[PDB]
Every structure is written in C-alpha cells, then in structure tokens.
Write a protein that binds this ligand. Structure first.
Ligand SMILES: Nc1nc2c(ncn2[C@@H]2O[C@H](COP(=O)(O)OP(=O)(O)OP(O)(O)=S)[C@@H](O)[C@H]2O)c(=O)[nH]1
Ligand SMILES: C=C[C@@]1(C)CC(=O)[C@]2(O)[C@@]3(C)[C@@H](O)CCC(C)(C)[C@@H]3[C@H](O)[C@H](OC(C)=O)[C@@]2(C)O1
Ligand SMILES: Nc1ncnc2c1ncn2[C@@H]1CC[C@H](COP(=O)(O)OP(=O)(O)OP(=O)(O)O)O1
Ligand SMILES: [Cl-]
Ligand SMILES: [Mg+2]
Ligand SMILES: [Mg+2]
Ligand SMILES: [Mn+2]
Lengths: 189, 189, 330
C-alpha cells in the first residue's frame, strides 16, 4: 500500500569524480578493484544510520555512486529538514576519511528539497521501498546542477533552514530541465 | 580481512536494456502525486510481468528509468534476443497505458551487450545492480534513442544472428558519448 | 606457490629500477631505449645550463666561449622531435667540461635534476656513435616516469612472483588502492640520499620527509593493517658519496641527527666509514620509529640497505626477501 506524506525532506549526494576514477584493466580485474572502493565508501555512509542523532534518517537507495536518503517518513515541526543537512555534513567527514587512506580527493555534491511524496512499493517483482513525486525530482535536480563541496537547496527549503538558524547564499536563477527558472540557494558551512 | 566482504560476481556474454520516460519532470509537475504513482505503477507492474515472460531479470527502477538484463543469473545464448523481445512488448505496453490513462507517456529504449559485474554494495538496504563500461554504454544508448523505438549497438546486433531488420541509428549525432566512443548504432524496425 | 609483491614509494625512489633488476636476474629491445637515453642526456645538460642564471648567487661560466653553446642548448630546449646532430654532442660535452657548469651541477639539489645526469654526461662519446649499443647498466640508469600500474611475472626456484610497479608522484598515488586487496607483501622504496632535496610536485616539501609521511600513511593505512612491509633504503651509493663529500650536512635538514649515535647491533660493511654507517642507520631508524608505534604483531617491517643500480646488491637483498616470505608463511 502507498501512503501520502506532507513534509518529507529528500537528499541526493553524488560523487561526480568517481565515474572518471573507474577504469577496466587486467590489473584492476576488469574494474572489480574500483567497485571494491565504492563498496567501502557506501559502507561508511551506511554506518552513520546507527548513530542516535540519525535515527530519523531513512536510506532509500544508492543510484550508481549517488546516495539517496530522506527524513520525515516516521510522521520544530521542521527540525527533520535541518537534520538532513546535518547528515550531509557527516557524509563529507566519511568521504574525507576514505580519501585519506585511498590517496584520492573525492568530493561530495549535495542537493536537498522538501514537500509531499508518496511512499511504498511499486511493480510486481521485489518489495523495494521507494518515494515518488515532484519533490523527489527537484531534490535530484539540486544535485545534478550543484557545485562540489556545496549543498544546494530550493527557495522554500532555504526559508525553513533560516528559521532553524541556517545561513544561505543565493546561487541565482537557473533553468532546471522540466521546471524552468528556479531561484536556488547554497547552505553556508 | 581488512576490506569488507564484497558480494559481487563477474559475467560475460550478457545483454542490458534501459528504458526511460521522456519529460517525466515536466509530467510530474502537472498531475497530483497520486496520479503519477498510479500511472507509473500501472506501467512498471506490466513490465515486471513481461520481464519474467522474456527471461529478463529486472534490476531496479530509478524514478522513471527502468532496466533489466538477460544472461543472468544463469548463462543463456539466447540473450540478445530476450532484450529485443522485451523492448518489443514494453513499447506496446506503454501504448496501452497511454490510452486508458490519458497521460502522455513515452519511453526511449536502449540495448548493448558485453560483460557486467553484478550483486550488491554497502551494508544497508541491499538491491541487486550491475556495473561496467558496457552497462554505462547501454545507459547512453537509451539517452541517445528515439521516443518509442529500440536503439541497439553493433555489439548487440552481432548476437542477434540476423533475425531483426534494423536501420542506421545515427546515435553519434544524438548523443556525445556515442560519438566520442566511435559507436555504431541501429534502430530495430 | 605464488606471491604478489607491490612496489610503493615516492617518485624517483627507484621502484622501476627494482623491476628491471628482476628481469636481469630472473627472466632486441635495447634498440628502443637508445632514444630514451638520449632524452635523459639532453634533459640533463639543459637543466644544469638553465639553472646557472637562476641560482642565488648565479653561477658563472669559466670559459666565455661556452656562452655561445649555452645559447645553442637553450634554443633547442623545447624542440619536439630533436634529431641529435653530431653538433649537439660536441656542444654538450664542451659545456660539461666547463668548470662553471660543474660548480652549478654540484648545487643540483637546489633545482630539479635527474639522477642519471653524471652517468650519461661522462659517456657522451659512447652514446654519440651510430653503432651504439646500451649496456645493462645503461638501461638501469635510464629514467622514464611511470604512470599507471604495470605487472611483471618471474619464477625463482619454481616459486611464482607477480610484481606490481606504480607511479610514486602525488597524482598517481590514487591508483595504488587497486592493488591493496590480497597483496602478499609490500616493498616500500626510499631514496635515502634525497635528504637535501625537495619534491618536484611543489618544490618545497623535503624529499625524505615526503618519504616518511608516505610510509606513515602506508604503515597505518586501514586496508593494510595485516600486511608486512619490506623497506628498501635505496640509493646507498649516492648517500655515502654525499656524506663523505661534506657539503650538505644531514643535521641541516634533520636536526634530530645531532643526537643520534650508531646502535650497538650495527653491522657495517667491511671498510665502511663510520660516518656513512651512522648516516645510513639514522635514516633507517627514522622509518623504524614509525613502524614501532603501531601494528601490535599483526604485521612487521623488514629493512634492507639497497642500491638498485647494482645487480650484485639486488640479487643478494632479494634472496633475503625470498627467505622472509617463505619462513613467515606469507
Ligand atoms: N645512483 C643511483 N641511482 C639510482 C638508484 N636507484 C635508482 N636510481 C636511478 O634513479 C632514477 C629514478 O628511479 P626510478 O626507478 O625511475 O624511480 P621510480 O621510483 O620508478 O619513479 P616513479 O616511476 O615513481 S616517477 C633512475 O634514473 C634510476 O636509474 C640507486 O640506488 N643509485
Ligand atoms: C560506479 C561506477 C559506474 C561507472 C558504473 C556504472 O556502470 C554506473 O553505475 C551505471 C551506468 C550502472 O550501474 C547502471 C545504473 C546507472 C544509475 C545508470 C549507473 C550510473 O550512471 C553510474 O554513474 C553515476 C553518475 O553514478 C555508473 C556510470 O557508474
Ligand atoms: N525514486 C527515485 N529513485 C531514483 N531517481 C529518481 C526517483 N524519483 C525521481 N528520480 C529522478 C530525479 C529526476 C529523474 C527523472 O527525470 P530525468 O532526468 O529522467 O528527465 P526527464 O524525464 O525530465 O527528461 P528526459 O528523460 O526526457 O531527459 O529521476
Ligand atoms: Cl623517496
Ligand atoms: Mg530518468
Ligand atoms: Mg617508476
Ligand atoms: Mn526521463
């Protein structure tokens, strides 16, 4: 069964440079060794979900090398949105740790949005929980049109963040594929 | 062992099919979250059924992107044909859902054949997936496809054994990845 | 029984040289290396000549005649396909005989100069010949930057070895990871004589210090906790030559050296000058001092004094490595 929600915060965290790191040779076992590192990265991100401060974070899935998660699925009515931003900071710490031991410099590119979504399972194959909506689409666009080491949020999401004590800097108006001109902001770290 | 146990296995001689909705972000901006989900579930449930009938293993659904592979788990020399037949049934199903729903749904289909790595990554929320340059190519074949048609590569055509009539794909002129990689594409009739 | 050895270390430490010695030891092409040897030669003379006017204080030519040859070298410095006319070798040789050029060469630690500089310039008359055939030692000295991962396989008494060579420079290190999983043992190479020099990457970080930080990064790495490290303290010949010369004092770069005495269990080579003994062991201890701090038995560090360009020394130390792998059941 599908259930509607009014205020769910979605987040897409990408690693744009991974695709370039990935190569297939006889030395790296046809790219297996590269995937071995991706597995270590996802694992360190997945381990943050066990921290008491992140108990309200639900990992939906992982698209390629992008991490997708949401808060507010178990419903200062807005604190969960602020929590999502706290989780995006923690991923950076984890990726910085990986970089330290793998002699790389991978950087995360985040996009966060909030609004109504539909949650449940779809299709006829396997019971895989997921969330749909225009809110989820825009969250993803905030990632794909984002900047390395930045968290790009939408206008209303930015307003909510400010009430919570967050500084935001206007990125300007950008033409988002399918939505048109949208004013967006960068969260200040 | 200092590296997490990786649950990944390599597989040669397999086919990969990608399908994606045209203008899904534009569509989700018009109808209620319910409609989008009902329409999307009506479509993917059928695909999932068509997948089993064609010996195709559905991988995962990324919003509007649907994909599956043939030759997995167990080897099958009939692989290329399965994905081609899968595309055939898929394109037809999209038309029925377009009629009884009224929603403007159109999908591009892409196919490529080669080796893949498959299994799962991380610790939490496992989901079967595939990774390899060949899989990456299949993804671009979809992007470089045409609304309501099956876009295939020469690699895939060589496994078809000449059972389908194709025509020049010209994918190079529709997608930058296909050109830079010198890929010869075709379009099944 | 097969063993997978990985070669790690900073750029120019001697990793590729070690691999070459493996072929000369345990394993038609010489005609292609000639071009590389000539490039090293060209690169060597032009670098010394270009540094003359940029040093503080600048180095002056002993013969004003050679100023024209300097002008010559600098004009062809960036020529893509150089054809090496007999003129080049004449001018190059004349410059190498100029005392000014020599004095600048002595201060080569103040700029970036390839290791084979002196070796090749002393045999210009040999390389210039059109019937020139590179000796074993010539191929060992030839320097060519490694970028990517290369695999070499060889047998020793019916025992298999898979040796992996990688780039040591900063941008290349990101590839090492692809060889961490199931590595029998790691061979960490260090250019022991590079204490008075700085890395190419930024022109500021001390070469030996970079080696130390890099070793600490490998020894303490999260994916190499149970992997033992065979430490090759390479460039022993250049180290001794430098220590004896007395121009560059180790204590000017590594202050701690002033309070270092030779350990009791030291095994000096026959006729080895105490100063050389003291220096080579000090360097060894800077690396051991890191390996001692952590590990706790789940892996060890095996030091070796080494000179990669000496097939004699390498046959000996590699045999010592063969024993370590087998008696520890790696
Ligand atoms: N005199 C002397 N020269 C040495 C010794 N070991 C290596 N060399 C020389 O130093 C140079 C650099 O060594 P090389 O093997 O190319 O470094 P590398 O560690 O492979 O370097 P890279 O690929 O990371 S950039 C070569 O010209 C080599 O002949 C040594 O013990 N003594
Ligand atoms: C992990 C690396 C690599 C190269 C492996 C691979 O084939 C991919 O995972 C596919 C193509 C592949 O897994 C199929 C799903 C999807 C989502 C289409 C992937 C992404 O495009 C990945 O890139 C991104 C941008 O995450 C990509 C390309 O990443
Ligand atoms: N549950 C989800 N999982 C993964 N990705 C999702 C999910 N929901 C939405 N998406 C994403 C973010 C937006 C994207 C769909 O838009 P897409 O980028 O495919 O373009 P589009 O359909 O607007 O146009 P087109 O496909 O024609 O280029 O899919
Ligand atoms: Cl070094
Ligand atoms: Mg899509
Ligand atoms: Mg090298
Ligand atoms: Mn789409």
């Amino acid at each position: 069964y599908h259930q509607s929600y009014d205020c769910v915060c979605v987040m897409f965290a990408s690693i744009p440079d991974f695709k370039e790191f990935y190569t297939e040779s006889d030395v790296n076992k046809e790219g297996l060794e590269c995937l071995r590192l991706l597995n270590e990265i996802i694992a360190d991100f997945d381990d943050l979900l066990s921290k008491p401060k992140f108990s309200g974070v639900e990992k939906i899935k992982t698209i390629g090398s992008t991490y997708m998660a949401a808060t507010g699925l178990s419903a200062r009515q807005y604190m969960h949105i602020g929590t999502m931003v706290e989780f995006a900071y923690a991923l950076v710490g984890k990726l910085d740790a990986i970089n330290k031991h793998s002699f790389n410099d991978f950087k995360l590119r985040v996009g966060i949005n909030h609004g109504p979504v539909i949650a449940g399972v779809i299709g006829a194959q396997k019971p895989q929980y997921d969330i749909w909506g225009n809110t989820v689409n825009v969250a993803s666009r905030m990632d794909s049109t984002g900047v390395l080491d930045k968290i790009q949020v939408t206008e209303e999401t930015s307003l909510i963040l400010q009430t919570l004590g967050y500084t935001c800097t206007c990125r300007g108006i950008i033409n988002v594929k399918g939505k048109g001109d949208l004013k967006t902001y960068f969260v200040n770290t | 062992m200092m590296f997490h146990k990786i649950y990944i296995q390599k597989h040669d001689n397999v086919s990969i099919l990608f399908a994606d909705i045209e203008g899904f972000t534009s569509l989700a901006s018009q109808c209620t979250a319910q409609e989008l989900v009902m329409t999307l579930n009506e479509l993917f449930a059928r695909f999932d059924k068509l997948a089993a009938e064609n010996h195709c293993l559905r991988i995962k659904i990324l919003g509007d992107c649907y994909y599956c592979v043939s030759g997995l788990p167990e080897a099958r020399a009939d692989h290329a044909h399965c994905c081609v037949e899968m595309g055939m049934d898929m394109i037809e199903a999209i038309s029925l859902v377009r009629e009884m729903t009224g929603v403007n749904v159109n999908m591009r289909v892409g196919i490529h054949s080669g080796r893949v790595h498959c299994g799962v990554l991380g610790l939490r929320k496992w989901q079967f997936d595939v990774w390899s340059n060949d899989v990456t190519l299949a993804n671009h074949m979809e992007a470089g496809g045409k609304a309501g048609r099956i876009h295939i590569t020469k690699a895939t055509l060589s496994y078809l054994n000449g059972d389908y009539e194709v025509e020049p794909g010209c994918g190079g002129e529709r997608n930058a990845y296909l050109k830079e990689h010198s890929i010869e594409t075709f379009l099944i009739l | 029984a097969t063993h997978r050895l990985l070669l790690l270390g900073a750029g120019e430490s001697g990793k590729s040289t070690i691999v070459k010695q493996m072929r000369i030891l345990h394993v038609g092409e010489k005609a292609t290396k000639v071009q590389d040897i000539k490039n090293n030669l060209k690169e060597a003379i032009e670098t010394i000549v270009a540094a003359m006017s940029n040093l503080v204080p600048p180095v002056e030519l002993a013969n004003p005649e050679n100023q024209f040859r300097v002008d010559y070298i600098l004009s062809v410095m960036n020529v893509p396909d150089f054809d090496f006319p007999p003129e080049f070798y004449e001018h190059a040789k004349a410059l190498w005989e100029d005392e000014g050029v020599r004095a600048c060469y002595e201060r080569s630690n103040e700029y970036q100069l390839i290791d084979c500089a002196q070796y090749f310039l002393d045999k210009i008359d040999v390389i210039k010949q059109d019937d020139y055939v590179p000796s074993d030692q010539d191929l060992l000295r030839c320097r060519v930057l490694t970028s990517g991962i290369f695999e070499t396989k060889f047998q020793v008494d019916k025992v298999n070895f898979h040796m992996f060579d990688v780039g040591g420079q900063r941008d290349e290190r990101r590839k090492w990871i692809q060889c961490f999983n199931d590595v029998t043992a790691i061979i960490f190479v260090v250019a022991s004589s590079s204490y008075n020099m700085v890395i190419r990457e930024d022109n500021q970080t001390n070469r030996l210090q970079e080696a130390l930080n890099l070793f600490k990064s490998i020894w303490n790495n999260r994916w190499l906790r149970t992997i033992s490290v065979i430490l090759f303290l390479n460039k022993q010949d250049l180290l001794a030559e430098k220590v004896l010369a007395g121009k560059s004092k180790i204590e000017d770069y590594f202050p701690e050296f002033a309070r270092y005495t030779t350990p009791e269990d030291a095994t000096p080579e026959p006729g080895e000058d105490p100063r050389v003994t003291r220096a080579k062991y000090f360097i060894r201890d800077e690396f051991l001092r890191i390996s001692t701090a952590s590990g706790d038995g789940r892996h060890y560090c095996y030091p070796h004094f080494t000179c990669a360009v000496d097939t004699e020394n390498i046959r000996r130390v590699f045999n010592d490595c063969r024993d370590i792998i087998q008696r520890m059941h790696l």
